[PDB]
Amino acid sequence: PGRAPKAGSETIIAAAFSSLLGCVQDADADFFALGGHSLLAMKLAAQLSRQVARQVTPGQVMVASTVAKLATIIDAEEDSTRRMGFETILPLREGNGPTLFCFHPASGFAWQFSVLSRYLDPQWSIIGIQSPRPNGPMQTAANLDEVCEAHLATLLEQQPHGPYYLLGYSLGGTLAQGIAARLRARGEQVAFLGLLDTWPPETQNWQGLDPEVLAEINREREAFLAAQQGSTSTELFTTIEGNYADAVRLLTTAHSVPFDGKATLFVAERTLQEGMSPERAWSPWIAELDIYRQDCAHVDIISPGTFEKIGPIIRATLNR
Protein backbone atom coordinates (compact mmCIF):
# COMPACT_ATOMS: atom_id res chain seq x y z
CA PRO A 1 0.00 0.00 0.00
CA GLY A 2 0.95 3.67 0.07
CA ARG A 3 3.86 4.83 -2.08
CA ALA A 4 7.64 4.52 -2.09
CA PRO A 5 10.01 7.23 -0.83
CA LYS A 6 10.01 10.28 -3.11
CA ALA A 7 13.16 11.89 -4.49
CA GLY A 8 15.06 14.06 -2.04
CA SER A 9 13.88 14.38 1.57
CA GLU A 10 11.85 11.15 1.70
CA THR A 11 14.66 9.18 0.05
CA ILE A 12 17.19 10.64 2.50
CA ILE A 13 14.86 9.75 5.39
CA ALA A 14 14.27 6.19 4.19
CA ALA A 15 18.02 5.60 3.83
CA ALA A 16 18.46 6.86 7.40
CA PHE A 17 15.74 4.48 8.63
CA SER A 18 17.31 1.51 6.84
CA SER A 19 20.70 2.27 8.38
CA LEU A 20 19.23 2.25 11.89
CA LEU A 21 16.37 -0.28 11.94
CA GLY A 22 18.15 -2.58 9.52
CA CYS A 23 15.97 -2.86 6.41
CA VAL A 24 12.46 1.87 4.59
CA GLN A 25 10.60 0.45 1.60
CA ASP A 26 7.56 2.75 1.55
CA ALA A 27 6.71 6.29 2.67
CA ASP A 28 4.23 4.98 5.25
CA ALA A 29 6.72 2.98 7.33
CA ASP A 30 6.33 3.67 11.07
CA PHE A 31 9.69 4.10 12.89
CA PHE A 32 8.37 2.82 16.24
CA ALA A 33 6.01 0.03 15.26
CA LEU A 34 9.03 -1.60 13.59
CA GLY A 35 11.26 -1.45 16.66
CA GLY A 36 12.55 2.10 16.91
CA HIS A 37 12.62 4.15 20.11
CA SER A 38 13.60 7.63 21.32
CA LEU A 39 17.33 6.87 21.51
CA LEU A 40 17.37 5.46 17.98
CA ALA A 41 15.49 8.65 17.04
CA MET A 42 18.18 10.86 18.61
CA LYS A 43 20.58 9.17 16.20
CA LEU A 44 18.28 9.74 13.24
CA ALA A 45 17.82 13.44 14.05
CA ALA A 46 21.50 14.11 14.48
CA GLN A 47 22.22 12.04 11.36
CA LEU A 48 19.78 13.85 9.07
CA SER A 49 20.77 17.19 10.64
CA ARG A 50 24.41 16.86 9.55
CA GLN A 51 23.10 15.44 6.28
CA VAL A 52 20.66 18.14 5.13
CA ALA A 53 22.33 21.03 6.97
CA ARG A 54 19.22 21.74 9.03
CA GLN A 55 18.15 21.44 12.66
CA VAL A 56 16.33 18.11 12.85
CA THR A 57 15.18 17.19 16.35
CA PRO A 58 14.42 13.81 17.97
CA GLY A 59 11.13 15.41 18.94
CA GLN A 60 10.27 15.77 15.27
CA VAL A 61 10.71 12.02 14.83
CA MET A 62 8.56 11.26 17.85
CA VAL A 63 5.59 13.06 16.30
CA ALA A 64 6.30 12.23 12.65
CA SER A 65 7.22 8.55 12.90
CA THR A 66 6.57 8.17 9.17
CA VAL A 67 9.02 8.82 6.32
CA ALA A 68 6.27 10.91 4.74
CA LYS A 69 5.46 12.91 7.87
CA LEU A 70 9.08 13.49 8.88
CA ALA A 71 9.90 14.52 5.31
CA THR A 72 7.14 17.13 5.49
CA ILE A 73 8.61 18.46 8.74
CA ILE A 74 12.02 18.92 7.12
CA ASP A 75 10.44 20.41 3.97
CA ALA A 76 8.29 22.90 5.91
CA GLU A 77 9.46 26.25 7.28
CA GLU A 78 11.77 25.20 10.12
CA ASP A 79 10.34 28.11 12.12
CA SER A 80 7.09 26.22 12.67
CA THR A 81 8.61 22.86 13.63
CA ARG A 82 11.05 24.02 16.32
CA ARG A 83 8.91 22.86 19.25
CA MET A 84 7.63 19.58 17.78
CA GLY A 85 7.80 16.80 20.33
CA PHE A 86 8.30 19.38 23.09
CA GLU A 87 4.73 20.57 23.52
CA THR A 88 2.02 19.77 26.06
CA ILE A 89 0.32 17.41 23.59
CA LEU A 90 2.49 14.67 22.08
CA PRO A 91 0.75 12.88 19.19
CA LEU A 92 2.62 9.57 19.15
CA ARG A 93 -0.08 8.03 16.98
CA GLU A 94 -3.38 9.31 15.60
CA GLY A 95 -6.22 6.84 15.13
CA ASN A 96 -9.88 7.04 14.13
CA GLY A 97 -11.22 5.64 17.37
CA PRO A 98 -10.68 6.02 21.13
CA THR A 99 -7.64 7.72 22.63
CA LEU A 100 -5.24 6.44 25.28
CA PHE A 101 -3.85 9.44 27.12
CA CYS A 102 -0.41 8.75 28.59
CA PHE A 103 1.01 10.90 31.38
CA HIS A 104 4.69 11.84 31.64
CA PRO A 105 7.09 10.67 34.40
CA ALA A 106 9.28 13.15 36.35
CA SER A 107 11.18 14.16 33.18
CA GLY A 108 8.04 15.86 31.89
CA PHE A 109 8.36 14.01 28.57
CA ALA A 110 6.05 11.25 27.30
CA TRP A 111 8.36 9.95 24.54
CA GLN A 112 8.76 6.58 26.29
CA PHE A 113 5.14 5.76 25.55
CA SER A 114 6.10 5.22 21.89
CA VAL A 115 6.49 1.58 22.94
CA LEU A 116 2.67 1.28 22.80
CA SER A 117 2.65 1.81 19.03
CA ARG A 118 3.46 -1.84 18.31
CA TYR A 119 0.65 -3.16 20.54
CA LEU A 120 -2.52 -1.08 20.27
CA ASP A 121 -5.00 -1.84 17.52
CA PRO A 122 -5.01 0.72 14.63
CA GLN A 123 -8.14 2.59 15.72
CA TRP A 124 -6.35 3.82 18.85
CA SER A 125 -4.72 7.22 19.16
CA ILE A 126 -1.78 7.28 21.57
CA ILE A 127 -1.48 10.79 22.99
CA GLY A 128 1.17 11.75 25.49
CA ILE A 129 0.70 14.58 27.96
CA GLN A 130 3.90 16.51 28.73
CA SER A 131 5.14 19.42 30.85
CA PRO A 132 7.38 21.62 28.72
CA ARG A 133 9.62 24.44 29.94
CA PRO A 134 9.05 27.15 30.44
CA ASN A 135 5.44 27.38 31.58
CA GLY A 136 4.61 23.67 31.67
CA PRO A 137 2.61 22.88 34.85
CA MET A 138 5.51 21.18 36.67
CA GLN A 139 7.49 24.42 36.52
CA THR A 140 4.65 26.80 37.45
CA ALA A 141 2.68 24.64 39.92
CA ALA A 142 2.93 25.43 43.63
CA ASN A 143 1.69 21.92 44.50
CA LEU A 144 0.92 18.67 42.68
CA ASP A 145 -2.82 19.35 42.86
CA GLU A 146 -2.19 22.29 40.52
CA VAL A 147 -0.52 19.97 38.03
CA CYS A 148 -3.43 17.52 38.14
CA GLU A 149 -5.87 20.37 37.58
CA ALA A 150 -3.84 21.71 34.65
CA HIS A 151 -3.58 18.31 32.95
CA LEU A 152 -7.29 17.68 33.58
CA ALA A 153 -8.12 20.88 31.71
CA THR A 154 -5.80 19.79 28.89
CA LEU A 155 -7.45 16.36 28.79
CA LEU A 156 -10.98 17.81 28.69
CA GLU A 157 -9.94 20.02 25.77
CA GLN A 158 -8.62 17.01 23.85
CA GLN A 159 -11.68 14.89 24.64
CA PRO A 160 -14.66 16.72 26.22
CA HIS A 161 -16.67 13.57 27.02
CA GLY A 162 -15.89 10.11 28.35
CA PRO A 163 -15.31 7.28 28.62
CA TYR A 164 -11.63 7.90 29.34
CA TYR A 165 -8.59 5.65 29.02
CA LEU A 166 -5.57 6.80 31.02
CA LEU A 167 -2.05 5.44 31.48
CA GLY A 168 0.65 6.79 33.77
CA TYR A 169 4.25 5.94 34.55
CA SER A 170 5.68 6.76 37.99
CA LEU A 171 4.87 10.45 38.60
CA GLY A 172 2.59 10.18 35.58
CA GLY A 173 0.80 7.39 37.41
CA THR A 174 0.19 9.67 40.37
CA LEU A 175 -1.20 12.31 38.00
CA ALA A 176 -3.33 9.83 36.07
CA GLN A 177 -4.85 8.47 39.29
CA GLY A 178 -5.56 11.99 40.55
CA ILE A 179 -7.13 12.90 37.21
CA ALA A 180 -9.24 9.72 37.27
CA ALA A 181 -10.52 10.68 40.72
CA ARG A 182 -11.45 14.14 39.45
CA LEU A 183 -13.19 12.75 36.36
CA ARG A 184 -15.30 10.46 38.53
CA ALA A 185 -16.30 13.45 40.69
CA ARG A 186 -17.56 14.98 37.44
CA GLY A 187 -19.75 11.95 36.85
CA GLU A 188 -17.54 10.78 33.99
CA GLN A 189 -16.59 7.18 33.29
CA VAL A 190 -12.96 6.04 33.48
CA ALA A 191 -12.87 2.85 31.42
CA PHE A 192 -9.14 2.30 31.96
CA LEU A 193 -6.60 3.53 34.50
CA GLY A 194 -3.22 1.94 33.90
CA LEU A 195 -0.45 2.45 36.43
CA LEU A 196 3.14 1.54 35.58
CA ASP A 197 4.75 0.73 38.96
CA THR A 198 3.13 3.74 40.63
CA TRP A 199 2.87 4.03 44.42
CA PRO A 200 0.90 6.43 46.66
CA PRO A 201 3.27 9.27 47.61
CA GLU A 202 2.16 8.68 51.20
CA THR A 203 3.96 5.33 51.24
CA GLN A 204 7.15 7.22 50.38
CA ASN A 205 6.82 10.70 51.94
CA TRP A 206 6.68 9.43 55.52
CA GLN A 207 10.45 9.01 55.16
CA GLY A 208 16.00 16.82 47.96
CA LEU A 209 17.27 15.62 44.59
CA ASP A 210 17.49 11.89 45.28
CA PRO A 211 18.37 9.23 44.60
CA GLU A 212 21.61 10.39 42.98
CA VAL A 213 21.13 7.28 40.85
CA LEU A 214 18.03 8.98 39.44
CA ALA A 215 20.46 11.63 38.25
CA GLU A 216 22.88 8.90 37.16
CA ILE A 217 20.53 7.12 34.76
CA ASN A 218 19.50 10.57 33.56
CA ARG A 219 23.22 11.03 32.95
CA GLU A 220 23.25 7.60 31.32
CA ARG A 221 20.94 8.64 28.48
CA GLU A 222 22.81 11.93 28.69
CA ALA A 223 25.83 10.20 27.18
CA PHE A 224 23.71 7.90 25.01
CA LEU A 225 22.13 10.96 23.39
CA ALA A 226 25.41 12.83 22.96
CA ALA A 227 26.77 9.61 21.46
CA GLN A 228 25.32 10.78 18.14
CA GLN A 229 27.13 14.06 18.78
CA GLY A 230 24.69 16.64 20.06
CA SER A 231 24.59 19.33 17.38
CA THR A 232 24.28 22.72 19.12
CA SER A 233 21.15 21.79 21.09
CA THR A 234 20.87 20.93 24.78
CA GLU A 235 17.22 21.90 25.26
CA LEU A 236 16.21 18.29 25.80
CA PHE A 237 18.33 17.49 28.84
CA THR A 238 18.16 20.94 30.45
CA THR A 239 14.38 20.56 30.29
CA ILE A 240 14.61 17.09 31.84
CA GLU A 241 16.89 18.23 34.65
CA GLY A 242 14.66 21.21 35.39
CA ASN A 243 11.52 19.07 35.51
CA TYR A 244 13.21 16.44 37.70
CA ALA A 245 13.95 19.10 40.28
CA ASP A 246 10.34 20.26 40.20
CA ALA A 247 9.05 16.68 40.39
CA VAL A 248 11.01 16.18 43.63
CA ARG A 249 9.61 19.47 44.93
CA LEU A 250 6.03 18.61 43.97
CA LEU A 251 6.03 15.05 45.30
CA THR A 252 6.48 16.45 48.82
CA THR A 253 3.18 18.33 48.38
CA ALA A 254 1.45 15.22 46.99
CA HIS A 255 -1.60 13.68 48.64
CA SER A 256 -3.71 10.92 47.09
CA VAL A 257 -7.47 11.15 46.51
CA PRO A 258 -9.90 8.19 46.40
CA PHE A 259 -10.68 6.75 42.95
CA ASP A 260 -13.89 4.74 42.97
CA GLY A 261 -13.01 2.64 39.96
CA LYS A 262 -10.76 -0.16 38.82
CA ALA A 263 -7.07 0.32 38.15
CA THR A 264 -4.65 -1.94 36.29
CA LEU A 265 -1.26 -1.92 38.03
CA PHE A 266 1.96 -3.26 36.58
CA VAL A 267 4.41 -3.98 39.38
CA ALA A 268 8.20 -4.05 39.11
CA GLU A 269 8.86 -7.14 41.28
CA ARG A 270 12.61 -6.60 41.62
CA THR A 271 12.21 -3.29 43.45
CA LEU A 272 9.33 -4.24 45.76
CA GLN A 273 9.74 -3.38 49.44
CA GLU A 274 9.49 -6.19 51.98
CA GLY A 275 6.33 -5.55 53.96
CA MET A 276 4.49 -3.14 51.65
CA SER A 277 2.50 -5.04 49.01
CA PRO A 278 0.79 -3.16 46.16
CA GLU A 279 -2.64 -4.19 47.45
CA ARG A 280 -1.95 -2.78 50.90
CA ALA A 281 -0.48 0.48 49.64
CA TRP A 282 -3.40 1.32 47.35
CA SER A 283 -6.26 0.02 49.46
CA PRO A 284 -7.44 3.47 50.66
CA TRP A 285 -7.22 5.13 47.23
CA ILE A 286 -8.29 2.65 44.55
CA ALA A 287 -11.49 0.60 44.88
CA GLU A 288 -10.59 -2.32 42.62
CA LEU A 289 -7.07 -3.30 41.61
CA ASP A 290 -5.95 -5.78 38.93
CA ILE A 291 -2.23 -6.43 39.45
CA TYR A 292 0.26 -7.83 36.92
CA ARG A 293 3.74 -8.50 38.34
CA GLN A 294 6.70 -8.01 36.01
CA ASP A 295 10.22 -9.38 36.51
CA CYS A 296 11.98 -6.01 36.39
CA ALA A 297 13.16 -3.01 38.35
CA HIS A 298 11.19 0.24 38.61
CA VAL A 299 13.14 2.06 35.88
CA ASP A 300 12.56 -0.74 33.36
CA ILE A 301 8.79 -0.95 33.83
CA ILE A 302 8.34 1.09 30.64
CA SER A 303 11.17 -0.58 28.73
CA PRO A 304 10.43 -2.27 25.35
CA GLY A 305 11.56 -5.57 26.90
CA THR A 306 9.15 -5.42 29.81
CA PHE A 307 6.47 -4.29 27.35
CA GLU A 308 6.68 -7.52 25.40
CA LYS A 309 4.34 -8.69 28.18
CA ILE A 310 2.77 -5.45 29.42
CA GLY A 311 1.85 -4.31 25.90
CA PRO A 312 -0.39 -7.30 25.12
CA ILE A 313 -2.04 -7.14 28.56
CA ILE A 314 -2.89 -3.47 28.03
CA ARG A 315 -4.26 -4.20 24.56
CA ALA A 316 -6.35 -7.05 25.96
CA THR A 317 -7.61 -4.83 28.77
CA LEU A 318 -8.53 -2.01 26.38
CA ASN A 319 -10.34 -4.26 23.89
CA ARG A 320 -13.94 -4.53 25.15
Strand stretches in the chain, DSSP E: 89-93, 99-103, 125-129, 164-169, 190-196, 259-268, 286-294
**CA-CA distance, 24 to 13, in Å (whole number)?**
8
Cis ω for the linkage preceding 211 (within 30 of 0): yes
Q: Which of 122, 124, 100 is nearest to 113 (CA)?
A: 100
Q: Are 102 and 126 in contact (CB under 8 A)?
A: yes
The number of residues making up the chain comes to 320
Q: Which of 130, 150, 132, 154 is nearest to 141 (CA)?
A: 150
| Method used to solve the structure | X-ray
Angle between helices 38-52 and 213-226 (to 10 degrees): 30
Active site residues: 298
Q: Which of 128, 124, 101 is nearest to 114 (CA)?
A: 128
- For this entry, resolution in Å reads 1.9
Pairing outcome for strands 125-129 and 89-93: antiparallel
Kindly report the CATH number that applies to the domain delimited by 1-320: 3.40.50.1820
Torsion angle (degrees, nearest 10) of CA 124, 30, 156, 137 = 140
Instruction: Count the neighbouring beta carbons within 10 Å of the beta carbon of residue 51.
Output: 13
First to last CA, the chain: 29
Q: Are 168 and 177 in contact (CB under 8 A)?
A: yes
DSSP letters spanning 275-320: T--HHHHHTTTEEEEEEEEESS-GGGGGSTTTHHHHHHHHHHHH--
Instruction: Count the neighbouring beta carbons within 10 Å of the beta carbon of residue 122.
Output: 8
